[PDB]
Every structure is written in C-alpha cells, then in structure tokens.
Design an enzyme around this catalytic site. Structure first.
Site, PDB file in Angstrom:
ATOM      1  CE  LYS A  69     -15.337   5.089   0.831  1.00  0.00           C
ATOM      2  NZ  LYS A  69     -14.609   6.329   1.103  1.00  0.00           N
TER       3      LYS A  69
ATOM      4  CD  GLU B  28     -17.820   4.163  -4.948  1.00  0.00           C
ATOM      5  OE1 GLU B  28     -16.752   4.547  -5.399  1.00  0.00           O
ATOM      6  OE2 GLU B  28     -18.588   4.892  -4.178  1.00  0.00           O
ATOM      7  NE  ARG B  29     -12.529   6.820  -8.271  1.00  0.00           N
ATOM      8  CZ  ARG B  29     -12.762   7.129  -7.002  1.00  0.00           C
ATOM      9  NH1 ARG B  29     -13.367   6.293  -6.170  1.00  0.00           N
ATOM     10  NH2 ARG B  29     -12.382   8.311  -6.537  1.00  0.00           N
TER      11      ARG B  29
HETATM   12  N1  LIG Z   1      -3.806   0.631   3.016  1.00  0.00           N
HETATM   13  C1  LIG Z   1      -3.296   1.660   2.329  1.00  0.00           C
HETATM   14  N2  LIG Z   1      -1.958   1.816   2.300  1.00  0.00           N
HETATM   15  C2  LIG Z   1      -1.446   2.845   1.621  1.00  0.00           C
HETATM   16  N3  LIG Z   1      -2.078   3.792   0.933  1.00  0.00           N
HETATM   17  C3  LIG Z   1      -3.407   3.616   0.985  1.00  0.00           C
HETATM   18  C4  LIG Z   1      -4.081   2.602   1.638  1.00  0.00           C
HETATM   19  N4  LIG Z   1      -5.447   2.735   1.463  1.00  0.00           N
HETATM   20  C5  LIG Z   1      -5.572   3.810   0.717  1.00  0.00           C
HETATM   21  N5  LIG Z   1      -4.380   4.400   0.402  1.00  0.00           N
HETATM   22  C6  LIG Z   1      -4.122   5.560  -0.446  1.00  0.00           C
HETATM   23  O1  LIG Z   1      -5.316   6.310  -0.555  1.00  0.00           O
HETATM   24  C7  LIG Z   1      -5.858   6.187  -1.899  1.00  0.00           C
HETATM   25  C8  LIG Z   1      -7.350   5.977  -1.819  1.00  0.00           C
HETATM   26  O2  LIG Z   1      -7.605   4.641  -1.424  1.00  0.00           O
HETATM   27  P1  LIG Z   1      -8.965   4.082  -1.655  1.00  0.00           P
HETATM   28  O3  LIG Z   1      -9.097   2.744  -1.007  1.00  0.00           O
HETATM   29  O4  LIG Z   1      -9.294   4.182  -3.104  1.00  0.00           O
HETATM   30  O5  LIG Z   1      -9.894   5.122  -0.795  1.00  0.00           O
HETATM   31  P2  LIG Z   1     -11.516   5.072  -0.924  1.00  0.00           P
HETATM   32  O6  LIG Z   1     -12.050   5.266   0.452  1.00  0.00           O
HETATM   33  O7  LIG Z   1     -11.768   3.781  -1.634  1.00  0.00           O
HETATM   34  N6  LIG Z   1     -11.874   6.448  -1.742  1.00  0.00           N
HETATM   35  P3  LIG Z   1     -13.289   6.952  -2.396  1.00  0.00           P
HETATM   36  O8  LIG Z   1     -13.979   5.698  -2.809  1.00  0.00           O
HETATM   37  O9  LIG Z   1     -12.864   7.811  -3.542  1.00  0.00           O
HETATM   38  O10 LIG Z   1     -13.939   7.716  -1.293  1.00  0.00           O
HETATM   39  C9  LIG Z   1      -5.130   4.997  -2.497  1.00  0.00           C
HETATM   40  O11 LIG Z   1      -5.083   5.111  -3.915  1.00  0.00           O
HETATM   41  C10 LIG Z   1      -3.754   5.136  -1.866  1.00  0.00           C
HETATM   42  O12 LIG Z   1      -2.975   6.134  -2.497  1.00  0.00           O
HETATM   43 MG   LIG Z   2     -13.769   3.582  -3.454  1.00  0.00          MG
END
Ligand SMILES: Nc1ncnc2c1ncn2[C@@H]1O[C@H](COP(=O)(O)OP(=O)(O)NP(=O)(O)O)[C@@H](O)[C@H]1O
Ligand SMILES: [Mg+2]
Ligand SMILES: Nc1ncnc2c1ncn2[C@@H]1O[C@H](COP(=O)(O)OP(=O)(O)NP(=O)(O)O)[C@@H](O)[C@H]1O
Ligand SMILES: Nc1ncnc2c1ncn2[C@@H]1O[C@H](COP(=O)(O)OP(=O)(O)O)[C@@H](O)[C@H]1O
Ligand SMILES: [Mg+2]
Ligand SMILES: [Mg+2]
Lengths: 492, 467, 466
Positions: free
Chosen positions: C154, C180-181
């Site tokens: 996300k 969020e963080r």
């Molecule tokens: N487009 C991408 N390409 C490669 N790795 C990715 C990508 N998106 C996410 N990741 C990996 O997954 C991790 C989590 O991504 P992130 O966008 O922070 O997920 P999120 O849905 O924001 N998580 P959360 O908010 O904790 O539920 C990243 O730190 C990367 O290690």
């Molecule tokens: Mg997030």
C-alpha cells in the site's frame, strides 16, 4: 396563559445523539407519525414508550439539542406522487435535488402502504422487455413481476437496470399507452458522483423524460436511506393504481438493510442474526410485495420491481441473499468468473430463474426459447462430465455442439438493448441448428452481420414477427431461407 | 374490561388494564380504527399490564388509546360455509363476497389430540410423481414435508400435488398460505375456480382458503397457520370425512416468531432463533394430525434458510413428519426437476411389509446405484474413466440414466419446461426403473431418459433422437 | 460556557453544563492543563450533560474539572500558509517552525457538496504503472483506492504514485497520515524537503502535511482524516486549482471509530464494529470529491484486516471509489510487485468509449487468459501440466508470461528489487501486452518477462538469459 406548548401536541427533547431523539411529551403522537424539530428538521415516531418517544431524525442531528421543541404533524409519513416527478431527481422525501425548481405535485401518498391483496390482482402476462437476450430468453420478466439482480461488486448488476430503462424508449416514444413503461431508479447508500454519472447517461439516452430518480446517498442520514425504497415505491404505485405501467429499480437493498440495522440498533432494539434486526426479511417483503399486476377492475396497471443485492464471494446461499431470493419472482445471478471469462452479461444460467416462465414472453420468443433453459443446464453438466472426452456418443456430441453455439449467442454488449423480433431472429438461427457447423469463434461476428442484413433488407419479416408477435409458417420459411443462404455466403 | 395502550414498538403493544386483566392468548380489539385490529395477549408484565402481538399494522396507534378485552382467544368462522372462501388470520373474508355465515366459531388456539387418540393405519397415497412414489411414497393421512431452499420447487411440487391428488379427492381441502407470495394466492384462487374446485355460484366448493402472506406483520404470520389448521380440524372432528391440508410455507410460522422474539425480551437461542422454537413448533405440529375421528393428509412446504438443512428450523421439523421430500439446488441447478434428492428423501412406509418387496428392492436398488455413482464422481473427475472396471463403468452409465429417468415434466410447470406434463402410475414407475437396473436399456442414450413420463417415452425419444 | 467533568473513561469524557449546553460537534477546552485538550461534543445525554470524545490523552483529568465551550467545532488554519507545514488534528503546528499565520480558519466538520455540485468529466490519469494503466486506469479528479492486507505494498505504491504523479503536478497536494507509522511521516517529510516539494526557505512548497499517527488516542485518529480533508477543501473551492490528496491509511479512521464506539455506549454491529460505520464513512468520503469549483485527485490506502476483504471496513469502502487497486499477499509472495490482483482491480474508466477499443480489447484479453489459467490451476495442482492439452498448455504459458509482464520495478522499491525503477508509457503497455497475447513471444522464457519495463527489455533479458 401561553398555551402553545402543552405536552399533548408538542414535546421537548430529553436527549439527542446518533440521530435518535428521545422526546418528552408528544402525548398524542401516533406510532410512525412525522414530527417537526425547531430547526425545521423532520423526524419519525418509531418507539412510543411510557415515558418518552423514540424519534428517528431525517437529517443532521447536529441542529438538535436537549430541550428543543418538537411538534406533531398529525400525519403518518408520506410523499409527492405523480407525473410531475418524471425527469426529476428527488431525495428520499420528494424534495428536488436537481436544482430544477419545485415539483408541481398535486397528490401525495403514504410511503408505507400494504400491498394489494389476492382479489385486486391478475396473473402476470405482459412481458417486460429488458433488451438483453440472456434475460429476455432464459429468465423472462413480466409486468407486475419482481426479479432480483444479484452478484458481487462490479459484476454488472446496475448495467442490467440501465439497459432496461433505456430499452423502454421503443414503447415510450410510441403511440400505444398500454405498452409504455415509466421508470423509477432508487439509489441507496450509493455515491453522489456515481448517481450524477448515472443520470447523465440516462439523459444522454433520452430516458430521463420517463424516469424519476430517488436518491438517498452515502452521506444521507440512515433514515433517509432506509425510507428511500418505500418512497420510490409509492411514486410507482401512482402509475400502478392508475392503469399505467411502472418499473422500479432498488439499487441496492443491501445498503438499505445496513441503514435499517443502524437505525434499529441506535433505537436500542436488540440485534438479531448477523447483527440485523430480527425483521430484516419483513423489511424487504413488505416493500417488494407492492410490486404487482392489477386486474382490469383496478385499472390493469402494474408495478415491476428489479431489486439489487450485493453478495460477497459469489455466495448466494448467504442469509440476506436468500432472504431476498425468497421474496422475488426469480433472480438474475451474475458471476465475476463468467465476466472475466468473456461471458457478459455474466448471467449464470443454472442459478438464475424466472418464476413467471413463458407466460411473460411473446409467442415468438416462447417459440424459439421454450426449452432452451433446461437444455443449457443439461449442457453445462455434460460439458463438465467430459472435461476428459470419455468415449462420448453422438447425442452428447450434438449436445455439446449446440451448447457452445447457443452460449455465444447469449453474449451481449452494453447499451444496445435489442428489439424482441431481433432477438427471435438470432436465437432462431442457433436453436434451429443452422449454426451447428459454424466455428464458435465466428458466432459473434456472424450475429452482427446477419442482424445487419435482416434489419436493413428484411424489415418486412421483422415487422411481421414483431407485429403478429408469433412466428407463422411462412415467416418461419422466409427465415430458414435467409439464414441458410446468408450463412453460406458468410462462410465463403 | 377496557385497557389503554401504554407502549408501541413495532408489532408489539403493551396494554394497561385498570380492572380485570385479560388472560394470556386472549384477543383484544383496539378501539377507534377504520379496520379491525386484534392484539393477542402475549404476557403478563405485572402492574396490570399485558404485553401483546398485533395482528396487523401498528401505524397511527396512540399512547392512551382504548382497548377492549374480547374475553377469548381469536375465534374464526368454522364449518362448511368456509369452503370456496378466502379467510384472514382473524376469520374475516378477504374475497369481497360478503360475510361467512357459519353456525359456529372456533378459537384458533387449542390442545393437541391425546395419545389415545392416535391412529396407525398406513396406506400409500399414489401421486404420479416418479421420485416420490418410487423412493419416498406418501401415505394417506400421514404427515408429508417438502423441504427446500429458495426457488427449488417447494411450491410447484405443492401445485402438482393439488392437481394429481386434491382434484380427485372427495372430501375437503384446506390451503393455508402462511407468509408466502400474494401473487401466488391469486394464482391459486383463480385456478381453483377455473377448475371448479372452487364454485362461486353454488355450494360445490371443495376447498377453503386461508391467507397470511409476506406483506403482513409478524403477528399475522405467527398465526395464519393456526387459522388454517383450525378450519381443517373442524372437517376432521365435527364432520370427519377425510381432509387434505396444504400449508405453504410452515417455516414462515417460525420466522414470524423469531421476528418479534427480541421485542418480547428474550435471550436469543442458537442461529438467532427464539428459545421457544421447538416447543412453539410442538404445540402446533401436534394438532396437524390424523385421529380416530377423522383423517388429515397434510402437505407442508418447508423453507430451508441459507440452504442449510441443519438450520434450527428445518432441522426441528423432520421429527413431525411421516414422509419427507428433500429438494436440492444442486440437483435443480442441473436442470433435473423435480429437484428431489434421492438419497435424502424418506417415507415411513418404505417397508417391504407395506409397499412390497418389488417396490422395496427397486427403490433400494436405485439408491444403491446413485450412491455408488456419487462415490465415484469426485474420483473419475480427476483420475479419468479409463482405469475403471467395465463393471464399474456400467453403473456410471445406468446411474446417469436413472438420474434422468427420475426427472419429470410437471403439468404445473409447462411455462417452465416447455413440455407437456406427465403423470406416471406406480406400476409404470417400478417397472421402468426395474428395467433400467436390469440392463434392459443400456443401448438407449441418456438424453432419451431426460424429461419424460413412462419408460416407453424414453424409448420413443431415443428414436426421435436417433436423428 | 463552563461545564464540569462528570465522568472519564478512556477518550470519552462526559461534561455537565449549568447555563448553556453546547451543541453537538462543538469543541470544548479542558481547563487546568499543561497542553491543549480539546473535547468534541458527541451527544446530549439529557440532564444538561454532554458526552464528548477527547482529542488527546485523558490521563490526569479529574471529576469536577472545568471545561470551556469554545463556541464552535474544531477549526484549523487554512490557506497557502499551510503549504510546507506539518499540523495536528486540531491544526497546531508540529514541525517546530512557529505558528501557521493564516487569514482564515476552517472547521473540520462541513457538509458534502450537493448533487448539482457534482462533476462527470472522465479523464484517464496515466501513472506509468503497467498493471494500473492497462487493467484499472486511474482518472483525473477521480477517487482511487489501494486495498492491502498487512505489509503488501500500500505505502510503497503511494510513494511511487507521489513520485510519478505528485512530483510533476502543478497544483497543490495534501498528504494526510492517518493512524500509520510516525517514522513514515518523518521519512516523507525529509524526503519532500530534499526533492524541494517542501521548501523551508521560500514560499514554494506544494504540499501541506497533516498527521495523527499510531501513537494517538482514538479520538485523534478518528478526526485527522477530516483535518487533512479540510485543508484540501480549501484549495479546491477557495482557489479553483486542482488538488492531489493522499491518505495513508483511511482504514485507521474506521478502526478509530470502533475504538470509541463502545464507550459511547452503542450496541455493536457485526464484527464488533460501530453501528454507524457506513454513515461515518459516508459523510466523510463524500467530501473527498471533485466538483464544478475544483478537482481533487485522491489516492487512499485501505488496510484490510486479517486479509479479509469482506471485513465491514474495506467492504463498505469499495462503493466510494472510481478505481480500485486490490493488492494480494499471494501475488506478493510469488515475488510479483506490485502485488496487484489483475482480476480484482477495477476502474469506471475501463470503457471503450474512454480508453479506446484497442486498450479495451487488450485489457479484456489479458483478463480472459488469466481467468482461464485460474480455472486450470486446480488440476495443475495435483497432476501438474503433463495431462494438459496442447491448447491448454499454451494458455498457461502465455498467462504465466503475462502474469510476469505485469510486474515492474518501482524507483521507490529499488532497494528491494535490486533493479532500476521503470515508468512504462500507456501505448507501450497496450503494445507489449498485445504481442504477448498474439503469440509473438511464445519462444521467450517466462523469466525474461519478470521485473521489466517495456516489452523491449523483455526480449533483451531473454538474450542475457541466453
Ligand atoms: N513495489 C514493491 N516492490 C518491491 N518490494 C515491495 C514493493 N511494495 C512493497 N514491497 C516490500 O514489502 C514491504 C512492505 O511494503 P509496504 O508498502 O510498506 O506495505 P504496506 O501495505 O504499506 N504495509 P502495512 O502498512 O504495514 O500493512 C516493503 O518494505 C518491501 O520490502
Ligand atoms: Mg503502510
Ligand atoms: N454487457 C456488458 N458488457 C460489457 N461490460 C459490461 C456489461 N455490463 C456491464 N459492464 C461493465 O462491467 C462493469 C460492472 O458494471 P456494473 O453494472 O457497475 O456492475 P455492479 O455490480 O453494479 N458494480 P458495483 O455497483 O460497483 O458493485 C462496468 O465497468 C460496466 O461498464
Ligand atoms: N417441477 C419443476 N419443473 C420445472 N421447473 C421447475 C419445477 N419446480 C421449480 N421449477 C423452477 O423453479 C422455480 C422456483 O420454484 P418454486 O416452486 O417457486 O420454488 P420454492 O417454492 O421452493 O422457492 C419455478 O418458478 C421454476 O422456474
Ligand atoms: Mg451498481
Ligand atoms: Mg414458494
């Protein structure tokens, strides 16, 4: 002796929050009666308790405060009704929202009225053409019928409703008043821009003229959303009770129930199965029973309902989905699997039904599609049973060959509701085996070509089929000639 | 006595009596209303206040409004002058044909026949429906149940039974529409008439009608079955000439109770049902029964919420029956109508000592093969059919055929099937199956067996199919 | 007016008034505190008492304590002087840069634009993201939603989009950090500074920041969205030029509501959520919209609990979007990034009369092959490919190549992919997908398609693989 605020026709807010006012006084209010708040804000008397009245607020409770004066209205909730509404966009209470001026209403109607009994009706017999082959051929809809459109988010539920409203121009722009169909489209919990989108399309199609649009959107108070369907219903009964014909779309009853659940819990009525009030069924039955076909003694008018329900994970067996399936006169079930697969509409033949049957189809259409439904069912089975060509005879090879061809014919794009004769012509071609030898991939292309031919050249056969409403021996002959020859030239 | 309304919340209305508290079950009449509004006393809250269930809409009711204790439970016009008529939960004509001039009136509430009043005769009741007859034969005077989820054919089946049985009856019939579709009540009425079962000109009416549809408040729905049952009990006892009882749908009685149950202040039981589900059902189902005085042959439609046969309601009903016809969406979905599940339908008379060994061995034979095939289904599905023993690939054959021969084009579903309805006699059924089992048709194609009446039609259809 | 604290339970403070009862939605100021403590009126319990929701920690409060009616709802600084700044739920700076000196103030609670106020123009918004552009294209002034279970993509996606879109916008942007963080807020801030979007020197910043993170009490989290929201409203209506609105994560607002709901004394709905879930979402979502006055392109992140998309929160959210990007853990686990589910993402713009039939045909083309592959999967699962038809095997190959070709390296995710970010142009996407479909690459290996930009690179990757 200022006697304007006696506790018999007036009351004072004891407390307010979450849209529920606990009014003191109102000694003479009737259950379900409309009251008025100082702020011009209308409410509705739902709980008449010993020491207080539980009022449901039709608006932002931010304007209400403890102590406010509440006044009776002596009136059980009602709304504007009649032809003035056509081509206008109203809120759950009748008020215009299209900024096009006031409605010229002369009549009113209680939102909640019991549906006509046994005596005042007559069996559904007149078709209600959608313009969608799949529907009009397999799950026919008659006037006074209730047919549910159900499926997951984005399966194409609304589209079915829009095509149907658009298809009505044929008759509405026509002479015959009996064939005319005034439409009503109720948005519930929906989004304002989507609705705005929705009414644009209708306008562009020149369908607003005959449509009323009751909108009770995402930001509207729970009670507005809740009332909305009943309001729109009453508007449609106007036509129904006056020998006219109306079509109402409740898009969707899923969001309404939520609204109901909200309104209900806030009144402190104990939550039932899945958190809904024990009477959710009743919430919908009451409403949909109103859709009906009146006998000649009552004007021969009608009300046809197309309610929308949103499943989750294609699960139709679900409690709400089954609750509603058990009220309506059939259902049109759309699957996302079908859709992605290229089957659009994503109608699931097996799972969809019409409790009206052929009685709601023209003879021409009954002629061509009389047995098709069960055929396609039986086809889907064997299609499965031989996903390994298990030493398959002939009768089944034939079965598979028809099945596939027929399936392609049932496909259909958007916004191009076909005329009944047009449908018959194209189903004819497949049902009669004339296409059994064509390549499935060709079928779609063929239909466009063929349909072109007959429309342009042969409108004499089309007008006869349409007119006679049946397929006479000669028409059936002229048709055989056309398909077979054209097909040959087509496969050059 | 005259009470006053003190509280209104939906279908439930509390009433305060100054002197003399009407006993539980008593019917009260709300004063000052264009239409008659009956309140059934539900509880004694204390403080001279009774909790009640409204038999109709509660709109417009006002706190302080006047209520008169009728001094008795809901009583309805019972007797022969009910035949050919349409009645309310409260015994009011709803057909616009004027009063119902009966000699007597009866309270809808009443005790169930004693143990020493029970009968034990068991005669098969031939229907003409292949599946029913072969595998789960109905019994004259027994309790029959038609189970099904939404739109599986509960009603249609009930329709074909009225046709193939009610029509040649020769005794009365009572059809009570509980919480069903209004459209349907109209369809049925007009059909009875067009077929003389109902006679508007004379006294030849063979059927009394009672209605409490889906457009009613839970209170009406919680009672129509009683009304209908009450009518039927009369022809059983007071007259006694054998009665046919049709209810569609009895589930509605149960769901009606559930709808007001919270307003009655009860902790919910499992699945949201009221805690009194079973008992509620018991004191009711117990009246629907044949006695030494008379005979009732009840066919009740039974809704199955979410398609879950284990649901507290459908689940609780099984015990009350003598025969059960289970319908299945899965089967229906295949285009096989009636959508009866051959391995989930049962009848108390499926006894060699009762239907005889030929009937018995055939039925069981038919069931074994379907079960055999069911087992294999999932397996050939993946692993294919080759590895199958010719012995096993013959049951696959026969089963598929039987599966079809079980279907049937109903007379009442022509608008649906596009086929002329067929009525098969018991012997035509037993024989046709007997033969299929016997390998006597391993040559005809499956399709030939689909949507036909008697085996001959399957043979004929084969030829027609031959090209 | 001066009320007295009658009761305290978490974020729910009940205050009694003697002379003037404040209306619902009014902000009260608790007296006798080191820092500002605003209480937002929720309801009139009767008895001259009002039930309220605190906007900050309630520790230390004492029964009897004095409360002052601010006389209005939570108001916050609005105008260009917010650009480049970081602010609270209650509008106070939190960037240590002094007071936000604006001419006008605006209250967080406002009504949603009327029907007549709606807009119906539909313009595609190209993002450079292959899957997005091809299968569920965004739209100018539209509502976009990024669904995702924990740690699926996300945020990354929101960053990449800020990068690929926000950066070359020419108009304003508002980033609202909801539940969020905190570290993320910090990560963005400094980054924003670096790229010059935020300028602590001149008045040239194009982004206003609003935050109410994971460390705030429920009430704060339940209102920050509204706050960020308001900021955006100003630029839309009060100035006429197109705004961009990013929220991470809007689910947090709904969660927050559930946190206080019991305290408000409500009978819980399904899954323990507040009975007002839908309305709450509705009166808020309805303000995030484009109108005749201004345009708001909004991208909202929507966290999906337990990965359950049927959860009342996310479930009720779909209805408010114009385009939806559903992220999948399953896909992500396969190594495909972004982990977008191609059969589950949708867009109102996917219409031939809007994207053209070439675009409309490839799109539906890709989906149909992926759907087909999906059905074959059950079998492939027990018996593998062997028993597959020569025809079926070809769909599987193509699907697995299309599946791979849908992935792509983001600048924002370079540290993880180990590859240089790529931005594919729409026509490039339509094309590369056509060919794949058209069997123009049945010879290349799957791997060639994984993690690349344009199809051209997928051909090369093939050579390199030898
Ligand atoms: N487009 C991408 N390409 C490669 N790795 C990715 C990508 N998106 C996410 N990741 C990996 O997954 C991790 C989590 O991504 P992130 O966008 O922070 O997920 P999120 O849905 O924001 N998580 P959360 O908010 O904790 O539920 C990243 O730190 C990367 O290690
Ligand atoms: Mg997030
Ligand atoms: N016959 C059709 N052929 C092609 N596309 C269609 C057809 N009918 C509908 N659609 C498209 O399919 C998508 C779903 O249509 P729609 O009628 O909105 O489904 P829905 O179930 O109402 N969705 P939602 O209201 O968001 O849950 C839309 O993008 C339509 O344009
Ligand atoms: N015996 C049958 N033959 C053919 N079609 C049938 C049959 N029974 C049901 N159907 C189909 O199923 C639909 C629903 O049947 P219905 O009796 O209304 O189901 P239920 O009462 O169990 O909900 C009918 O309208 C018809 O389309
Ligand atoms: Mg829709
Ligand atoms: Mg029925």
């Amino acid at each position: 002796a200022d006697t304007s605020v006696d506790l018999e026709e007036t009351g004072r807010v004891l407390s307010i929050g979450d849209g529920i006012a606990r009014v003191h006084g109102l000694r003479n209010v009737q259950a379900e009666e409309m009251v008025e708040f100082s702020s011009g804000l209308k409410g509705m008397s739902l709980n008449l308790e010993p020491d207080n009245v539980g009022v449901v607020v039709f608006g932002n409770d931010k304007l209400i405060k403890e102590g406010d004066i509440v006044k009776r209205t002596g009136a059980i909730v009602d709304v504007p009704v009649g032809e003035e509404l056509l081509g206008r966009v109203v809120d759950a209470l009748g008020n215009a929202i299209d900024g096009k001026g006031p409605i010229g209403s002369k009549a009113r109607r209680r939102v909640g009225l019991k549906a006509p009994g046994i005596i005042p009706r007559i069996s559904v017999r007149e078709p209600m053409q959608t313009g969608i082959k799949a529907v009009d051929s397999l799950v026919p809809i008659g006037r006074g019928q209730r047919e549910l459109i159900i499926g997951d988010r984005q399966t194409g539920k609304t589209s079915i409703a829009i095509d149907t409203i658009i298809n009505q121009k044929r008759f509405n722009d026509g002479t015959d008043e009996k064939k005319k169909l005034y439409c009503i489209y109720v948005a519930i919990g929906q989004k304002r821009s989507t609705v705005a989108q929705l009414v644009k399309r209708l306008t562009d199609a020149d369908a607003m003229k005959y449509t009323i649009v009751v909108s009770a959107t995402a930001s509207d108070a729970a009670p507005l959303q809740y009332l909305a369907p009943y309001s729109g219903c009453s508007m449609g009964e106007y036509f129904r009770d006056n020998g006219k014909h109306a079509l109402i779309i409740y898009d969707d009853l899923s969001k309404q129930a939520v609204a109901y659940r909200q309104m209900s819990l806030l009144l402190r009525r104990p939550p039932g199965r899945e958190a809904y009030p024990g009477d959710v069924f009743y919430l919908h039955s009451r409403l949909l029973e109103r859709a009906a076909k009146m006998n000649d003694a009552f004007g021969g008018g009608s009300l046809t309902a197309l309610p929308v329900i949103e499943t989750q994970a294609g699960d139709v067996s679900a409690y709400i989905p089954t609750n509603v399936i058990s009220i309506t006169d059939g259902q049109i079930f759309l699957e996302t699997e079908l859709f992605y697969k290229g089957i659009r509409p994503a109608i699931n033949v097996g799972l969809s039904v019409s409790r009206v049957g052929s009685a709601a189809q023209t003879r021409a259409m009954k002629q061509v599609a009389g047995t098709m439904k069960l055929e396609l069912a039986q086809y889907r089975e064997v299609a499965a049973f031989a996903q390994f060509g298990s030493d398959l005879d002939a009768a089944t090879q034939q079965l598979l060959s028809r099945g596939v061809r027929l399936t392609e014919l049932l496909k259909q794009g958007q916004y191009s509701p076909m005329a009944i004769e047009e449908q018959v012509a194209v189903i004819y071609a497949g049902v009669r085996g004339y296409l059994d030898k064509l390549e499935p991939s060709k079928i779609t292309k063929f239909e466009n070509a063929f349909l072109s031919h007959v429309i342009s050249q042969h409108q004499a056969l089309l007008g006869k089929i349409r007119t006679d409403g049946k397929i006479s021996e000669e028409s059936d002959a002229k048709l055989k000639e056309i398909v077979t020859n054209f097909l040959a030239g087509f496969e050059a | 006595t005259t009470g006053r309304i003190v509280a209104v919340i939906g279908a439930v209305v509390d009433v305060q009596f100054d002197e003399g508290l009407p006993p539980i079950l008593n019917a009260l009449e709300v004063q000052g209303r264009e239409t008659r509004l009956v309140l059934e006393v539900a509880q004694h809250l204390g403080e001279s206040t009774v909790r009640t269930i409204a038999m109709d809409g509660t709109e417009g009711l006002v706190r302080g409004q006047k209520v008169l204790d009728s001094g008795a439970p809901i009583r309805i016009p019972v007797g022969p002058e009910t035949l050919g008529r349409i009645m309310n939960v409260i015994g009011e004509p709803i057909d616009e044909r004027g009063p119902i001039k009966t000699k007597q009136f009866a309270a809808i509430h009443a005790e169930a026949p004693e143990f020493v009043e029970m009968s034990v005769e068991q005669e098969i009741l031939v229907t003409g429906i292949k599946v029913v007859d072969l595998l789960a034969p109905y019994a004259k005077g027994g309790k029959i149940g038609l189970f099904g989820g939404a739109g599986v054919g509960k009603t249609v089946l009930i329709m074909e039974l009225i046709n193939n049985v009610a029509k040649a009856h020769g005794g009365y019939s009572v059809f009570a529409g509980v919480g069903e579709r209004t459209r349907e009540g109209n369809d049925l009425y007009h059909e009875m008439i067009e077929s003389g079962v109902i006679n508007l000109k004379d006294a030849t009416s063979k059927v009394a009608l009672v209605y409490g549809q889906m457009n009613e408040p839970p209170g009406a729905r919680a009672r129509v079955a009683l009304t209908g049952l009450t009518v039927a009990e009369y022809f059983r006892d007071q007259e006694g000439q054998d009665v046919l009882l049709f209810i569609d749908n009895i589930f509605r009685f149960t769901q009606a109770g559930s709808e007001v149950s919270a307003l009655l202040g009860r902790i919910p039981s499992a699945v949201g049902y009221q805690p009194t589900l079973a008992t509620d059902m018991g004191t009711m189902q117990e009246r629907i029964t044949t006695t030494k005085k008379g005979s009732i042959t009840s066919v009740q439609a039974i809704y199955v919420p979410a398609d879950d046969l284990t649901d507290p309601a459908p689940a609780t009903t099984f015990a009350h029956l003598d025969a059960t016809t289970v319908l299945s969406r899965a089967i229906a979905e295949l285009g096989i109508y009636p959508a009866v599940d051959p391995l989930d339908s049962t009848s108390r008379i499926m006894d060699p000592n009762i239907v005889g060994s030929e009937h018995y061995d055939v039925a069981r034979g038919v069931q074994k093969i379907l079960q055999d095939y069911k087992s294999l289904q999932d397996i050939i599905a993946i692993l294919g059919m080759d590895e199958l023993s010719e012995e096993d690939k013959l049951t696959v054959s026969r089963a598929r055929k039987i599966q079809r021969f079980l279907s049937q084009p109903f007379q009442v579903a022509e608008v649906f099937t596009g086929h002329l309805g067929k009525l098969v006699p018991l012997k035509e059924t037993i024989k046709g199956f007997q033969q299929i089992l016997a390998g006597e048709y391993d040559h005809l194609p499956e399709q030939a067996f689909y949507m036909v009446g008697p085996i001959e039609e399957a043979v004929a259809k084969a030829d027609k199919l031959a090209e």
